[PDB]
Enzyme design. Structure first.
Site, PDB file in Angstrom:
ATOM      1  N   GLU A 166       0.824  -1.218   0.000  1.00 20.78           N
ATOM      2  CA  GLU A 166       0.000   0.000   0.000  1.00 20.78           C
ATOM      3  C   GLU A 166       0.856   1.265   0.000  1.00 20.78           C
ATOM      4  O   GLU A 166       0.677   2.152   0.838  1.00 20.78           O
ATOM      5  CB  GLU A 166      -0.997   0.010   1.164  1.00 20.78           C
ATOM      6  CG  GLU A 166      -1.908  -1.207   1.216  1.00 20.78           C
ATOM      7  CD  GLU A 166      -2.679  -1.414  -0.073  1.00 20.78           C
ATOM      8  OE1 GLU A 166      -2.501  -2.474  -0.710  1.00 20.78           O
ATOM      9  OE2 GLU A 166      -3.463  -0.518  -0.449  1.00 20.78           O
ATOM     10  N   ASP A 167       1.799   1.326  -0.950  1.00 21.64           N
ATOM     11  CA  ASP A 167       2.704   2.457  -1.182  1.00 21.64           C
ATOM     12  C   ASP A 167       3.555   2.796   0.040  1.00 21.64           C
ATOM     13  O   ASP A 167       3.767   3.970   0.349  1.00 21.64           O
ATOM     14  CB  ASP A 167       1.947   3.701  -1.667  1.00 21.64           C
ATOM     15  CG  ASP A 167       1.564   3.615  -3.130  1.00 21.64           C
ATOM     16  OD1 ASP A 167       0.476   3.082  -3.432  1.00 21.64           O
ATOM     17  OD2 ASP A 167       2.354   4.078  -3.982  1.00 21.64           O
ATOM     18  N   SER A 168       4.046   1.780   0.746  1.00 19.23           N
ATOM     19  CA  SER A 168       4.982   2.003   1.836  1.00 19.23           C
ATOM     20  C   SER A 168       6.413   1.978   1.305  1.00 19.23           C
ATOM     21  O   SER A 168       6.667   1.691   0.131  1.00 19.23           O
ATOM     22  CB  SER A 168       4.782   0.963   2.935  1.00 19.23           C
ATOM     23  OG  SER A 168       3.750   1.345   3.825  1.00 19.23           O
ATOM     24  N   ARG A 183       0.184   4.006 -10.976  1.00 16.19           N
ATOM     25  CA  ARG A 183       0.497   5.424 -11.102  1.00 16.19           C
ATOM     26  C   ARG A 183       0.968   5.784 -12.504  1.00 16.19           C
ATOM     27  O   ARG A 183       0.912   6.964 -12.876  1.00 16.19           O
ATOM     28  CB  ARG A 183       1.557   5.818 -10.073  1.00 16.19           C
ATOM     29  CG  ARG A 183       1.091   5.684  -8.633  1.00 16.19           C
ATOM     30  CD  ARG A 183       2.242   5.846  -7.655  1.00 16.19           C
ATOM     31  NE  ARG A 183       1.786   5.808  -6.269  1.00 16.19           N
ATOM     32  CZ  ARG A 183       1.787   6.857  -5.452  1.00 16.19           C
ATOM     33  NH1 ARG A 183       2.222   8.033  -5.881  1.00 16.19           N
ATOM     34  NH2 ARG A 183       1.354   6.729  -4.206  1.00 16.19           N
TER      35      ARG A 183
END
Ligand SMILES: [Mg+2]
Ligand SMILES: [Zn+2]
Ligand SMILES: [Zn+2]
Lengths: 55, 124, 42, 208, 291, 61, 41, 94, 62, 398
Positions: free
Chosen positions: J165-167, J309
Site C-alpha cells: 500500500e505504497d509504503s 500510477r
C-alpha cells in the site's frame, strides 16, 4: 486569473506552463510562467514617424 | 472547448494555419470543439510537446477537486431519511416517528431471519 | 555580552532601555556564545 | 462534538501483527489513561475503536486490541485491513477512540470488532480479502507448476502454515534427482482445513 | 550427522583487503560469517563529545555526527569491556577498559583557510590512535578567529547500532561457476555468430582462441550470474549450447576493511564470536533440558 | 543591494536571494501577476451581439 | 549556406544563447522591469 | 533463561526451542546443521516478529534419539566446524 | 556542507579523497578517470564524489 | 495589419534562420544577438502567422521552409518542470504533483547565511547532493539549488510485505551515516513596548537563556516582567538570540531553537516523478538482498506502485544514473543529458549500461541476506534522486 478557463490553450506555447498547475480550488487559474518568458513595459518613442518611412 | 486536434500531432500539424488547433478553420466559422486525438507514441519512447499538450488537456479534467459536495450532501440527505428505520420484535419494519409502518416483512433473499433489533435503514 | 551587527564590538548592556550599540547607530544585537561545556551524542 | 481519551497518529504497515490487533507505540500508550475499577495506563488486550476519516461506510469503525510495540510516533496494522478502512499507507492518518466504562468495553468487541464484521453488509460477501503481494504470490505459486521446492524449503515454509505437511507427490523428477521435490499447488493447499471442499468451474479449481 | 571439513585457500591478503575460498561447506556458514563480520565484530568509536568553544560555521551536532564516523585503530576491542558492563568505571573521560579520551583544540589566525583534519586529534592511549592512510579526514574549515576546542571519549560498541562500529566496508561471497561447453554445436556456428556470442556477455567471461578459431573460458569467476549469453544462445537457436550452474559447496570471499581491524583478524574475530554465541546458546539448552 | 560589487558580496546581505520581493512588517511579500483583458482591441461578444471600445485614460467607452 | 555550419555547432549555439539569456535578463526580470518603470516614468 | 524447552503434546518426539536475543545468523546454521542428521524429520526456524528479538526452532526426531539430544549434537558438530575453519585460516595466513 | 566521512550504502572511508579529486579535476582529467585513479570500483562509492556540492565555500564568505 | 507595442504582452525568444549565417561563419552575449538580428522576441499574436521548427538539427536541417526555430523544446515548461528528467515519459497527473507540491515540500538547501534570517521555520539537510543527470535548464541556469534531496540506491522488490500500500522500506544503517538527515530551526518572537527580565532555570539576568541550553516543555524561552513558556511539542537547543528595535520605540526579540530530525518510522518521502510513500520499516544492513559486489540497496519500493500510477522514466533515470556511475573497463561522449523533450532512446541507455559491465535492463542477480540462497529473478537496482518531504509523523500526534 481572477474569476473554459481551467483548461490549457494552444496560446500557452512558450508563455506559461501547461503541465504544472496547482490542484484544488485554483486548478488552471494560477499558471506558472515559462523559463524563456519576458514581458513588455513601454515604447518611449513614437513609431508613427518610423511607420511612415516604410511605405 | 474552443480548439480541436490536428490528427497528426507532429511539428507540421502545429504550424498549419488551416488546422482545428488554432480555432475557426473556415469550413462558416467555428465556435466550439469536442477534442478527439490519437497518440501514436507511448510512455516509453517519449511524447511530442504537442502530444504532451494533448495529454495534459485530456487529463486536466481528472485533477480538479471540484463537484465534491455531491457525495457528501447526498449521503447526508439520504441518512436523514433512513437513520430512524429499524426492525421490530413483531417482525415488521417500523419507523421511529410514531411507530409508523414502512414494510410488513423483510425480503426473502437472506437465510438469516434473526434481524429483529438491527437498524436496517442505516445499513441500507 | 551582546555583539552588534554591521560592526565588531561587544556591548554587554543588560538594561531595560539600552537596545542599541555604543558608537554605532544601528540597533541589532546578537547574543554572544559563552564557553560552557555541553554534551551531544555521536 | 469532540471528546476526551482520543488520539490521532499516522499509520504504517506491519504484516507481523494479527488482524484484530492494532500496533500502539509504547510512548503514547504510557500516557493514555483508561478507567478501571482509579486510572491506569493502556496495556495489551484492551480494545480501542479505530476510524479513518471520512467514515465511508459502517465497516470503517473496527474495534481492535492494543498491541504494545517498541516504535514511537506511529501506529501500524496489517495491510489486509486497508480495504474496510478504504485507505493506504500514504501519510493518511487514522484516529482512534478509547472507551472508559466497562459497559462500552463489553459491547465493543461483541458487535463492532473484526470477528463480528466478517460479512460485507453491502453485497453479502466477505469483507476482508487478499491484498496485492499476497494475491500476486498466490497467483504465481499456482500458475507456474514448474518451480519445485525441496524438503528444506517446504519445512521452512511450513513454520508459518497452520496445518501439517502433505505427501511430497514428486518422488523422482530426473534420473539425477536425489531428493523428493514439492509442487507449488501443494504449498497453497496447506492453508485449507481437511474438511474443506471448494469448486470453481470457470478456472477448473477442484478442492477435495 | 556430524561436522563438516571446510578448506581455505587464500588468493590475496593485504592489511585491509582479503580474498580467499571456502570449499566443502554450505551457504549458511558463508552467509553467517558475512553477517557476523558486517554487523557484530566490535570496534571502538567516538560516541560522546563535549564542545565548548565551537565558533565555526557548521552546526553543533554536525561535528559530533561526523566525528563518530572516523575509524579508529581497534586492536584492543576484543579485550575491552562495554560501557554497560563496566562496574568500576561509571564513565567520565579516560577509563581503564571502557573509555578512551580524546582531545582536540584548534584556532586559526591566518589570512588563508585552515583545514582541521583528523591528524590533530590527540588521544591518551597510543594504541587507540586514529587511522592514518595522506591529509586525513576533514572535520571543519576555519577562518580568522572561529576557534574550536572539544573533548570526546571513545567506547567499544557493536556494529549493529549506529553503523559506525562496523569494521568491514563491503564483505561478500559469490558462487563459483563451472562453464559447460558442448563443443559439438560450436563447430556448426558461423564465424560471425561466434562474435555475437562473445559480445553478448557483460563482463570478460568468454574469449576466442587464435590457434583454434573456437571459443574458450578464461577467468570463470567473473560471470556475476547475469543470464545474457544463455538468452543469446536460445535466441540463436542453440538452447543446449552453454549451461552455467552454480556450485553449492564452493564460494569465493572478498573481505574489505576500513583500516580498523586487519583483514585476517576480522575473519578470526568473526569465527570466534560465532563460536562464543553457539556456546552461549548451548549452555541454556544443556542446563534446562538435561538438568 | 542593487549593483553591489565586492563590498556587499560577503557582508551578510544575500543568501540564495534573487531580490524581487517587498518588506512590510518583517514578512516578505510578492506580487502575483493578474491576467486582465486587453483594452486596445475591439471586443466582440454574443448574447447580446455587441462590440465595445475600451477606455484609454478617461471613461470614454 | 544551408548546411555549412554543422549539426553540432547549432546544438551548442542554442545552449550558449540560453545561458546568456539567464545572464542578461535573469529569472525575475518581469518583476523588476515593471517596478523600475513605475519609479522612473 | 535464554533458551526455553517446550515439548509438543500433539506430535510424538517433538519440541520447540525459543532463543532470546537471536537472529537469522544462528538460526539458519542450526537449521541447516539439523538437516544433516539422519534422525531428524523436521528442521526449521522462524522469526515471527522483528520487534521482539526471538527465534523459534521446531525439531522433530524419530524413535532413536531426542530433540534436545539432536540440538546438542547439531551445536557440538557446528563448533568443531568453526574450530576446523579457524585452524585452516590460521594455516593459510602464515 | 563538506564531503561525508563514510559512504552511505557502501561504508568506505571517502572523507580524505575530496581534495585529491579536486586536484585531479584541476588537470585535464574526466570524472571517470579521476574516480578510477582514486581506487573506486563500485558505483555506490563513485556516486558520492560526483554528487557532492561544496557549500562551505559560500558558508565562510557570507 | 495589427501592430501592438504596449505592456502585458508575453514574449519568448526565437532564433530566425534567415540570417543564421551572419555572425556564425564569420561567448555570445544576448544584446549582440538582438542587435545583429539573429534572435528576436516574438509575441503570441506574431507567432501565429509563421512557421516554427522544433529541433535545431533534426527538423531544421533538411527543410528550409520554416524561417524560425526554437532554442529548445524543454523551455516551454516552468523552472520546476523543465528540471524533471523524462517528464514526457510520465503520466500528466504525476508530473503535476512533483512540479507543484513535492518541489515546495522537499527539504534541501535553505540559506548560505542563517544569521540574518529569523524566519518562523527553516529546515536544511546536512549533506545536500546534486543529481547525476544533467538537464539543460540546470546547465544553462548554473543553479545547484534547483534540486532538493539526495539520490539513494533504489531497488524495486518486495520486502516481507512491509512495502504494501505504497509504503517504503529503507536501510536503517545508511540513515545513521548521514543520509536524509536534516535540522530544524524554529524561532519564537516577542514584543515589548513590561520589560525583558528574569524576575524569578537556564535563564540569565536579561530574560533570555544562554546559547547551548537544552529547552523542553515547560521552560521559559522568553522572560518578561508575562513570560512566554514552551508548549507540549516545542523543544530544541537554542542557536542564537537576536534583539532588535524599530523607530517607534518598540523592542523585539527572536530566540531560535535548533533540533536535528532523523528519519523516523512515519516520515513521508517522494520522488522526482510523483511517487509518494512514508517510511514503514527500518531493516538492518545484514538482512537486505545484497549484490555480488557487496552493494546493499538503500530504499526498497514496491513493484505494484508502477502500473497504477503509470510512471516510466524513474527506471530510466535509475538506468541512466547507474550507467553514469559505473566505470567502463573512454569516459567521454557519454550520455549524461536528461533534457525532457529530447530524451535519448532505450537503445542508447541499454548500450551504455552494457558497456559498463552490467545487464541491459538494469536488473542484477542478488542473493538473500537472511539465508544466502540465490533469487530466481534479477532485481532492478540503480541510484534514483529521492526527496524528503516536510510531513513527519511526530508533528501529527494529537
Ligand atoms: Mg494515501
Ligand atoms: Zn554597532
Ligand atoms: Zn571504564
Amino acid at each position: 486569473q481572477q474569476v473554459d478557463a481551467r483548461y490549457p490553450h494552444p496560446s500557452h506555447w512558450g508563455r506559461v506552463c501547461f503541465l504544472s498547475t496547482p490542484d484544488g480550488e485554483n486548478c488552471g487559474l494560477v499558471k506558472n510562467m515559462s523559463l524563456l518568458g519576458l514581458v513588455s513595459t513601454q515604447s518611449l518613442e513614437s513609431v508613427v514617424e518610423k511607420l511612415f518611412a516604410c511605405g | 472547448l474552443s480548439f480541436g486536434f490536428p490528427r497528426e500531432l507532429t511539428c507540421a500539424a502545429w504550424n498549419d494555419p488551416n488546422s482545428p488547433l488554432r480555432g475557426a478553420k473556415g469550413k462558416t466559422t467555428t465556435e466550439s470543439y469536442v477534442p478527439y486525438g490519437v497518440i501514436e507514441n507511448s510512455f516509453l519512447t517519449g511524447l511530442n510537446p504537442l502530444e504532451s499538450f494533448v495529454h495534459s488537456v485530456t487529463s486536466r479534467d481528472s485533477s480538479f477537486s471540484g463537484n465534491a459536495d455531491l457525495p457528501g450532501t447526498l449521503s447526508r440527505r439520504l441518512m436523514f431519511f433512513m437513520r430512524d428505520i429499524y426492525a421490530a420484535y413483531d417482525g415488521t419494519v417500523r419507523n421511529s416517528f410514531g411507530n409508523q409502518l414502512v414494510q410488513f416483512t423483510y425480503e426473502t433473499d437472506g437465510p438469516v431471519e434473526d434481524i429483529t433489533g438491527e437498524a436496517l435503514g442505516s445499513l441500507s | 555580552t551582546y555583539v552588534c551587527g554591521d560592526c565588531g564590538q561587544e556591548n554587554t548592556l543588560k538594561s531595560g532601555d539600552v537596545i542599541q550599540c555604543r558608537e554605532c547607530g544601528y540597533r541589532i544585537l546578537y547574543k554572544k556564545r559563552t564557553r560552557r561545556v555541553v554534551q551531544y551524542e555521536a | 462534538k469532540r471528546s476526551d481519551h482520543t488520539f490521532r497518529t499516522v499509520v504504517v504497515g506491519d504484516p507481523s501483527l494479527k488482524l484484530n490487533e492494532i500496533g500502539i507505540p509504547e510512548s503514547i500508550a504510557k500516557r493514555l489513561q483508561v478507567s478501571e475499577h482509579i486510572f491506569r495506563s493502556l496495556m495489551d488486550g484492551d480494545t480501542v475503536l479505530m476510524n479513518r476519516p471520512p467514515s465511508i461506510h459502517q465497516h470503517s469503525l473496527i474495534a481492535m486490541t492494543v498491541r504494545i510495540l517498541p516504535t514511537t510516533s506511529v501506529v501500524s496494522l496489517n495491510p489486509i485491513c486497508c480495504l474496510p478502512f478504504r485507505g493506504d499507507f500514504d501519510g493518511d492518518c487514522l484516529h482512534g477512540y478509547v472507551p472508559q466504562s466497562i459497559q462500552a468495553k463489553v459491547e465493543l468487541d461483541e458487535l463492532v470488532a473484526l470477528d463480528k464484521q466478517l460479512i460485507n453488509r453491502q453485497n453479502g460477501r466477505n469483507l476482508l480479502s487478499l491484498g496485492q503481494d499476497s494475491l500476486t504470490a498466490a497467483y504465481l505459486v499456482n500458475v507456474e507448476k514448474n518451480c519445485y521446492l525441496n524438503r528444506a524449503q517446504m519445512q521452512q515454509l511450513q513454520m508459518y502454515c497452520p496445518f501439517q505437511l502433505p505427501p511430497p507427490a514428486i518422488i523422482k523428477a530426473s534420473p539425477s534427482s536425489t531428493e523428493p521435490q514439492w509442487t507449488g499447488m501443494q504449498l497453497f493447499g496447506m492453508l485449507f482445513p481437511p474438511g474443506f471442499d471448494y469448486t470453481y468451474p470457470l478456472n477448473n479449481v477442484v478442492v477435495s | 550427522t556430524y561436522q563438516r571439513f571446510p578448506k581455505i585457500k587464500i588468493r590475496e591478503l593485504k592489511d585491509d583487503y582479503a580474498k580467499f575460498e571456502l570449499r566443502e561447506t554450505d551457504v549458511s556458514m558463508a552467509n553467517a560469517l558475512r553477517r557476523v563480520m558486517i554487523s557484530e565484530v566490535p570496534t571502538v568509536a567516538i560516541d560522546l563529545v563535549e564542545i565548548e568553544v565551537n565558533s565555526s560555521v557548521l552546526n553543533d551536532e554536525f561535528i559530533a555526527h561526523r566525528l563518530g564516523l572516523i575509524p579508529l585503530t581497534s586492536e584492543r576491542a576484543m579485550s575491552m569491556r562495554f560501557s554497560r558492563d563496566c562496574d568500576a568505571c561509571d564513565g567520565d573521560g579516560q577509563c581503564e577498559f571502557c573509555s578512551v579520551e580524546f582531545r582536540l583544540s584548534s584556532k586559526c589566525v591566518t589570512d588563508q583557510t585552515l583545514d582541521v583534519t583528523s591528524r590533530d586529534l590527540y588521544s591518551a592511549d597510543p594504541t587507540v590512535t586514529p587511522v592514518d592512510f595522506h591529509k586525513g579526514i576533514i572535520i571543519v574549515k576555519l577562518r580568522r578567529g572561529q576557534e574550536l576546542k572539544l573533548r570526546a571519549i571513545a567506547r567499544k560498541g557493536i556494529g549493529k547500532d549506529h553503523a559506525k562500529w562496523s569494521p568491514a566496508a563491503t564483505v561478500t561471497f559469490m558462487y563459483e561457476p563451472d562453464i559447460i561447453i558442448n563443443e559439438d554445436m560450436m563447430d556448426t556456428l558461423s564465424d560471425e555468430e561466434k562474435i555475437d556470442l562473445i559480445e553478448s556477455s557483460p563482463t570478460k567471461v568468454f574469449g576466442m582462441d587464435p590457434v583454434t578459431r573456437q571459443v574458450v573460458v578464461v577467468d570463470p569467476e567473473a560471470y556475476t550470474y547475469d543470464e545474457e549469453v544463455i538468452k543469446k544462445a536460445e535466441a540463436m537457436g542453440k538452447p543446449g549450447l552453454i549451461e552455467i550452474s552454480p556450485k553449492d559447496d564452493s564460494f569465493i570471499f572478498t573481505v574489505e576493511s576500513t583500516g580498523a581491524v586487519k583483514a585476517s583478524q576480522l575473519v578470526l574475530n568473526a569465527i570466534d564470536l560465532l563460536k562464543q554465541k553457539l556456546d552461549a546458546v548451548r549452555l541454556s539448552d544443556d542446563t534446562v533440558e538435561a538438568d | 543591494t542593487s549593483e553591489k560589487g565586492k563590498e556587499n558580496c560577503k557582508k551578510g546581505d544575500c543568501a540564495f536571494d534573487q531580490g524581487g520581493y517587498f518588506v512590510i512588517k518583517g514578512a516578505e511579500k510578492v506580487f502575483i501577476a493578474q491576467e486582465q483583458m486587453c483594452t486596445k482591441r475591439l471586443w466582440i461578444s454574443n448574447s447580446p451581439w455587441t462590440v465595445s471600445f475600451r477606455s484609454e485614460n478617461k471613461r470614454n467607452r | 549556406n544551408l548546411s555549412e555550419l554543422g549539426e553540432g555547432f547549432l546544438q551548442s549555439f542554442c545552449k550558449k544563447a540560453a545561458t546568456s539569456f539567464f545572464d542578461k535578463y535573469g529569472l525575475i526580470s518581469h518583476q523588476l522591469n515593471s517596478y523600475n518603470y513605475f519609479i522612473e516614468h | 533463561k535464554k533458551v526455553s524447552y517446550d515439548r509438543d503434546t500433539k506430535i510424538i518426539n517433538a519440541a520447540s526451542f525459543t532463543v532470546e536475543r537471536e537472529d537469522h545468523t544462528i538460526g539458519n546454521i542450526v537449521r541447516m546443521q539439523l538437516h544433516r542428521d539422519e534422525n531428524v524429520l523436521f528442521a526449521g526456524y522462524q522469526l515471527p516478529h522483528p520487534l521482539k528479538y526471538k527465534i523459534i526452532v521446531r525439531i522433530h526426531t524419530t524413535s532413536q534419539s531426542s530433540p534436545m539430544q539432536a540440538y546438542n549434537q547439531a551445536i557440538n558438530d557446528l563448533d568443531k566446524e568453526l574450530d576446523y575453519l579457524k585452524n585452516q585460516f590460521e594455516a593459510e595466513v602464515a | 556542507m563538506i564531503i561525508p566521512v563514510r559512504c552511505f550504502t557502501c561504508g568506505k572511508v571517502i572523507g580524505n579523497k575530496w581534495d585529491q579529486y579536486l586536484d585531479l579535476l584541476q588537470l585535464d582529467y574526466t570524472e571517470g578517470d579521476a574516480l578510477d585513479a582514486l581506487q573506486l570500483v563500485r558505483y555506490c562509492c563513485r556516486r558520492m564524489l560526483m554528487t557532492h556540492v561544496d557549500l562551505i565555500e559560500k558558508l565562510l564568505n557570507y | 495589419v495589427r501592430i501592438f507595442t504596449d505592456a502585458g504582452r508575453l514574449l519568448r525568444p526565437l532564433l530566425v534562420v534567415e540570417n543564421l549565417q551572419k555572425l556564425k561563419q564569420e561567448q555570445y552575449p544576448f544584446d549582440h544577438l538582438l542587435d545583429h538580428g539573429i534572435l528576436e522576441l516574438i509575441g503570441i499574436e506574431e507567432e501565429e502567422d509563421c512557421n516554427t521548427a522544433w529541433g535545431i538539427k533534426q527538423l531544421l536541417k533538411e527543410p528550409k521552409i520554416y524561417t524560425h526555430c526554437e532554442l529548445d523544446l524543454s523551455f516551454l515548461l516552468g523552472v520546476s518542470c523543465a528540471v524533471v528528467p523524462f517528464a514526457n515519459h510520465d503520466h500528466g497527473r504525476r508530473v503535476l504533483y512533483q512540479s507543484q507540491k513535492h518541489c515546495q515540500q522537499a527539504i534541501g538547501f535553505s540559506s548560505t547565511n542563517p544569521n540574518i534570517r529569523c524566519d518562523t521555520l527553516s529546515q536544511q539537510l546536512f549533506y545536500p547532493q546534486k543529481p547525476l543527470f544533467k538537464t539543460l535548464a540546470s546547465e544553462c541556469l548554473k543553479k545547484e539549488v534547483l534540486f532538493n534531496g539526495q539520490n539513494a540506491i533504489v531497488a524495486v522488490n518486495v520486502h516481507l510485505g512491509y512495502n504494501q500500500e505504497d509504503s517504503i522500506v529503507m536501510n536503517k544503517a545508511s540513515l545513521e551515516r548521514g543520509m536524509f538527515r536534516s535540522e530544524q530551526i524554529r524561532s519564537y518572537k516577542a514584543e515589548v513596548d513590561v520589560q525583558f527580565g528574569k524576575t524569578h532555570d537556564s535563564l540569565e539576568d536579561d530574560g533570555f537563556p544562554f546559547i547551548g541550553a537544552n529547552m523542553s516543555t515547560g521552560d521559559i524561552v522568553i522572560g518578561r516582567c508575562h513570560s512566554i513558556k514552551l508548549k507540549h511539542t516545542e523543544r530544541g537547543i537554542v542557536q542564537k538570540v537576536v534583539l532588535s528595535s524599530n523607530d517607534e520605540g518598540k523592542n523585539f526579540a527572536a530566540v531560535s531553537l535548533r533540533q536535528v530530525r532523523s528519519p523516523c518510522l512515519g516520515d513521508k518521502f517522494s520522488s522526482m516523478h510523483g511517487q509518494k510513500g512514508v517510511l514503514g520499516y527500518l531493516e538492518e544492513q545484514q538482512n537486505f538482498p545484497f549484490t555480488i559486489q557487496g552493494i546493499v540497496p538503500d530504499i526498497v519500493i514496491n513493484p505494484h506502485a508502477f502500473p497504477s500510477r503509470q510512471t516510466p522514466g524513474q527506471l530510466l533515470e535509475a538506468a541512466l544514473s547507474k550507467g553514469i556511475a559505473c566505470p567502463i573497463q573512454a569516459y567521454t561522449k557519454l550520455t549524461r543529458h536528461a533534457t525532457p523533450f529530447s530524451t535519448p532512446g532505450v537503445t542508447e541507455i541499454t548500450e551504455q549500461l552494457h558497456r559498463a559491465g552490467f545487464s541491459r535492463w538494469g536488473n542484477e542477480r542478488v542473493y538473500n541476506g537472511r539465508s544466502g540462497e540465490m533469487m530466481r529473478s534479477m532485481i532492478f537496482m540503480g541510484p534514483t534522486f529521492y526527496q524528503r518531504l516536510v510531513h513527519m509523523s511526530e508533528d501529527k500526534v494529537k
